[PDB]
């Protein structure tokens, strides 16, 4: 439900998820790159206590 949840997930996990092909993963990477973000980031203490 949040960008912080999405960016912590790796490409392999998204690829293994059902109903998600390579095209949709490429689109997700493109829209994240449009804002200077990427998949595979690590965060401490998430969710952000809310």
């Amino acid at each position: 439900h949040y960008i912080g949840d999405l960016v912590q997930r790796t490409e392999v996990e998204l690829l293994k998820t059902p109903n998600l092909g390579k095209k949709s993963l490429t689109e997700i990477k493109d829209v994240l790159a449009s804002r200077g973000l990427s998949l595979g980031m690590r965060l401490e203490n998430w969710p952000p206590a809310s």
């Binding site: 490409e11 490429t26 990477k29 493109d30 790159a33 990427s38």
Partner: protein
């Protein structure tokens, strides 16, 4: 006698590429893209040339587009732009919506 090493634009770009969570394929694509950048900051070849230089047929053009979009947000903002309009739009996309005009 010996001089000292100097950091160029491509050295800074590769330093930023090194510390970015890319995959191996994405890292090779980024290496080719940074190789295809001149000293004014513009891309000198079409993405077809980069795709051909990668050397495998399992990669499509949209992956190259995504890697290029990720790279274009490096420092300085607007680097590796296709043309002037692309550079101006990339620079504008980093501005807040409260800008008057």
């Amino acid at each position: 006698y010996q001089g000292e090493t100097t950091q160029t634009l491509q050295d800074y770009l590769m330093w930023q590429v090194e510390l970015t969570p890319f995959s191996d394929t994405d890292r090779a694509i980024a290496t080719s893209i940074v190789d295809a950048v001149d000293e004014t900051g513009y891309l000198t070849v079409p993405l077809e040339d980069i795709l051909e230089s990668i050397g495998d047929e399992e990669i499509d053009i949209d992956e190259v587009e995504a890697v290029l979009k990720r790279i274009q947000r490096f420092d300085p903002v607007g680097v590796a732009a296709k043309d002037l309009r692309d550079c101006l739009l990339i620079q504008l996309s980093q501005f807040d919506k409260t800008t008057p005009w």
